[PDB]
Amino acid sequence: KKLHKEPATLIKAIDGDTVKLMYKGQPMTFRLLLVDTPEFNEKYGPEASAFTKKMVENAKKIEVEFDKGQRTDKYGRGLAYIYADGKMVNEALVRQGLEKVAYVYKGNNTHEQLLRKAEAQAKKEKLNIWS
């Protein structure tokens, strides 16, 4: 069975992989699935943040797509794929070499191959975090 998208409104972009959204009428902090800043290098943190911010702010429509596993993490943050006018922020960050694939767990790994495909290209290009 496929996942489903639900509407949400931007409240504020926080950093490369955290955004605060109005979801089902309530403010909620969302952590993007399947991505992280490199473990030992935050050189591209500000660029990643700016990128996410531009993408979500310029969007006419933001959508939340939960996966089949845990919907919130140990902090109560929502765990989702976030779309901006149909473009997956999570995927975009990875194809641009701004964040890498990370935190890959059964149930919450529907888009794992998709993001790994994007990451492979970024890696090949030695782009940003892969330089």
Ligand SMILES: Cc1cn([C@H]2C[C@H](OP(=O)(O)O)[C@@H](COP(=O)(O)O)O2)c(=O)[nH]c1=O
């Ligand atoms: C992306 C993601 C993060 N997390 C937790 C792991 C990390 O825990 P610890 O904080 O205990 O290291 C933290 C990383 O989030 P940030 O990268 O936003 O700091 O969020 C999950 O549990 N599930 C997920 O899918």
Ligand SMILES: [Ca+2]
């Ligand atoms: Ca972050």
